[PDB]
Paper text:
Mutual gliding motility protein C (MglC), a paralog of GTPase-activating protein Mutual gliding motility protein B (MglB), is a member of the polarity module involved in regulating motility. MglC is required for polarity reversal and interacts with MglB and RomR. The crystal structure revealed that, despite sharing <9% sequence identity, both MglB and MglC adopt a Regulatory Light Chain 7 family fold. Using isothermal titration calorimetry and size-exclusion chromatography, we show that MglC binds MglB in 2:4 stoichiometry with submicromolar range dissociation constant.
There was no good structural template to use as a model for solving structure using molecular replacement. The closest homologue available at RCSB PDB shared ∼8% sequence identity. So, we solved the crystal structure using Selenomethionine Single-wavelength anomalous diffraction (Se-SAD) experimental phasing technique at 1.85 Å resolution. MglC crystallized in P6522 space group (a = 96.69 Å, b = 96.69 Å, c = 58.28 Å, α = 90°, β = 90°, γ = 120°) with one molecule in an asymmetric unit. The final refined model contains all 120 residues of MglC. The crystal structure revealed the typical RLC7 fold (α1β1β2α2β3α3). MglC monomer contains five antiparallel β-strands sandwiched between three α-helices. We also observed an electron density for a metal ion in the crystal structure having a square pyramidal geometry. We placed Na+ which is coordinated by two water molecules and main chain oxygen atoms of L64, T66, and V69. The native and Se-SAD structures superpose well with r.m.s.d. of 0.144.
Residue numbers in the entry:
A (entry chain A), B (entry chain A): 1 to 120
The structure:
């Protein structure tokens, strides 16, 4: 709950951002901020693919617990993701539409991750 | 072996490319092309992190076997990776230095993956 201001900041800064969330390695979502605004595209196709990535996101996210791995992406045709470690139990995930700014997404999540880590 | 011309094309096109390889889900490398040329940076630190990503790359690569997942990245401070599925048994991996062109890497691997798939 202390996180949501940071999750909202990520979505606000990244063109095409669907959602920014904290997720547990136990597969239980902790907090989210979702794109509320009328997008310049129809995002329902993206929401379908994002739902269909959730199992695989948490599987790939496990690699973040290794010292060397700092960032993981699991991407579909319509949806890109960026994930970073926030604690031994939690990771941060940004989902954006494939036509969004993936470079800005990676940069903004790198800047925001320490702020989320500080709220634990 | 029919692949290597395609692996060389990827490394030649992407600034900061360390290597482009075909790897089995059995954890056995099939073919590679490595950056031979004198880089504008010292890449030994990157080679160390790339070695330390190998276990986790193959773990995250498993997600490519799902219908929805088309592309996976497992990144360190010094090394970025992009992976795509080439067959039920094999995936394609591009590793580049963190200061390389990640956007171009993703684009070139997407263009090259079908050419590698055609050589099976
Ligand atoms: Na890590
Ligand atoms: Na797939």
């Amino acid at each position: 709950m202390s996180f949501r201001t940071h999750l909202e900041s990520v979505v606000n800064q990244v063109e095409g951002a669907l959602a920014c969330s904290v997720m547990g390695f136990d597969g239980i979502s902790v907090d989210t901020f979702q794109k509320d605004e009328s997008a310049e595209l129809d995002l329902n196709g993206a929401w379908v693919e994002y739902a269909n990535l959730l199992t695989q996101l948490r599987n790939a996210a496990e690699t973040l617990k290794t010292g060397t791995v700092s960032e993981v992406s699991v991407n579909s045709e319509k949806v890109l993701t960026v994930m970073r470690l926030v604690s031994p139990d939690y990771f941060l995930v940004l989902a954006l539409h494939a036509d969004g700014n993936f470079g800005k997404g990676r940069y903004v999540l790198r800047v925001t991750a320490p702020k989320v880590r500080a709220e634990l």
